[PDB]
Enzyme design. Sequence first.
Site, PDB file in Angstrom:
ATOM      1  N   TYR A  28     -36.356  66.545 -12.764  1.00  0.00           N
ATOM      2  CA  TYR A  28     -35.575  66.323 -11.556  1.00  0.00           C
ATOM      3  C   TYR A  28     -35.825  67.221 -10.358  1.00  0.00           C
ATOM      4  CZ  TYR A  28     -32.724  62.973 -14.229  1.00  0.00           C
ATOM      5  OH  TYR A  28     -32.274  61.891 -14.961  1.00  0.00           O
ATOM      6  N   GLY A  30     -37.449  68.300  -7.553  1.00  0.00           N
ATOM      7  CA  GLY A  30     -38.516  67.820  -6.703  1.00  0.00           C
ATOM      8  C   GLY A  30     -38.157  66.428  -6.214  1.00  0.00           C
ATOM      9  N   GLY A  32     -37.373  62.937  -5.991  1.00  0.00           N
ATOM     10  CA  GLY A  32     -37.127  61.972  -7.048  1.00  0.00           C
ATOM     11  C   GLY A  32     -36.513  62.588  -8.296  1.00  0.00           C
ATOM     12  N   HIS A  48     -27.700  68.062  -8.461  1.00  0.00           N
ATOM     13  CA  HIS A  48     -27.982  68.144  -7.037  1.00  0.00           C
ATOM     14  C   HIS A  48     -28.452  66.785  -6.539  1.00  0.00           C
ATOM     15  CE1 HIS A  48     -30.359  69.613  -3.408  1.00  0.00           C
ATOM     16  NE2 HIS A  48     -29.135  70.065  -3.201  1.00  0.00           N
ATOM     17  N   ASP A  49     -29.255  66.098  -7.347  1.00  0.00           N
ATOM     18  CA  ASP A  49     -29.732  64.779  -6.958  1.00  0.00           C
ATOM     19  C   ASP A  49     -28.553  63.806  -6.854  1.00  0.00           C
ATOM     20  OD1 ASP A  49     -32.267  65.867  -7.010  1.00  0.00           O
ATOM     21  OD2 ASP A  49     -33.059  64.546  -8.562  1.00  0.00           O
ATOM     22  N   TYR A  52     -26.579  64.286  -3.671  1.00  0.00           N
ATOM     23  CA  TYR A  52     -27.238  63.699  -2.516  1.00  0.00           C
ATOM     24  C   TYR A  52     -26.992  62.197  -2.486  1.00  0.00           C
ATOM     25  CZ  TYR A  52     -30.027  67.628  -0.690  1.00  0.00           C
ATOM     26  OH  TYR A  52     -30.447  68.782  -0.079  1.00  0.00           O
ATOM     27  N   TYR A  73     -27.695  71.694   8.950  1.00  0.00           N
ATOM     28  CA  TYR A  73     -26.284  72.070   8.923  1.00  0.00           C
ATOM     29  C   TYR A  73     -26.193  73.576   9.117  1.00  0.00           C
ATOM     30  CZ  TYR A  73     -27.474  73.251   4.040  1.00  0.00           C
ATOM     31  OH  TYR A  73     -28.068  73.758   2.912  1.00  0.00           O
ATOM     32  N   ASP A  99     -25.971  71.733  -1.580  1.00  0.00           N
ATOM     33  CA  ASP A  99     -26.992  72.769  -1.666  1.00  0.00           C
ATOM     34  C   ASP A  99     -26.443  74.099  -2.150  1.00  0.00           C
ATOM     35  OD1 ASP A  99     -28.632  70.793  -0.602  1.00  0.00           O
ATOM     36  OD2 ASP A  99     -28.499  71.609   1.435  1.00  0.00           O
TER      37      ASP A  99
HETATM   38  C1  LIG Z   1     -36.929  73.956  -3.099  1.00  0.00           C
HETATM   39  O1  LIG Z   1     -36.369  73.521  -4.375  1.00  0.00           O
HETATM   40  C2  LIG Z   1     -35.882  72.261  -4.510  1.00  0.00           C
HETATM   41  C3  LIG Z   1     -35.372  72.013  -5.807  1.00  0.00           C
HETATM   42  C4  LIG Z   1     -34.826  70.756  -6.098  1.00  0.00           C
HETATM   43  C5  LIG Z   1     -34.746  69.707  -5.160  1.00  0.00           C
HETATM   44  C6  LIG Z   1     -35.095  68.219  -5.281  1.00  0.00           C
HETATM   45  O2  LIG Z   1     -34.786  67.624  -6.320  1.00  0.00           O
HETATM   46  O3  LIG Z   1     -35.693  67.607  -4.303  1.00  0.00           O
HETATM   47  C7  LIG Z   1     -35.282  69.992  -3.852  1.00  0.00           C
HETATM   48  C8  LIG Z   1     -35.836  71.249  -3.538  1.00  0.00           C
HETATM   49 CA   LIG Z   2     -34.911  65.612  -7.465  1.00  0.00          CA
END
Ligand SMILES: COc1ccc(C(=O)O)cc1
Ligand SMILES: [Ca+2]
Length: 123
Positions: A28, A30, A32, A48-49, A52, A73, A99
Amino acid sequence: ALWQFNGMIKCKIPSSEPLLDFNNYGCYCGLGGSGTPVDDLDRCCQTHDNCYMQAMKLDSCKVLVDNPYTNNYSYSCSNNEITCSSENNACEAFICNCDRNAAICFSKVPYNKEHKNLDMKNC
Ligand SMILES: COc1ccc(C(=O)O)cc1
Ligand SMILES: [Ca+2]
């Protein structure tokens, strides 16, 4: 936005470059995400995903063309403590909170390098 999140994570973990250390980790962390989280850190990202995905459903977020990754923000870092500003409107605030909770999560769980650049065939 993405740049805010970067500084937010460095607020809790001063020695890292979040865009490098936490990007492309597990299923997860990154752009997607799918499958079962491999570890708690990956679970932090899952939440966190979802956060969002939830924010995108807010009437207040739909009006603006900004994306959660591109919506700036206000927040501050002080004594390694993160604070989302009251000057933020509904959408931004919600994202700011997403975040914030993720940054703290990141700093409270183990890091397993083995999962860096995980084969998306495990998701
Ligand atoms: C910079 O670290 C991240 C970690 C997770 C998320 C994500 O899931 O996109 C975004 C940035
Ligand atoms: Ca993600």
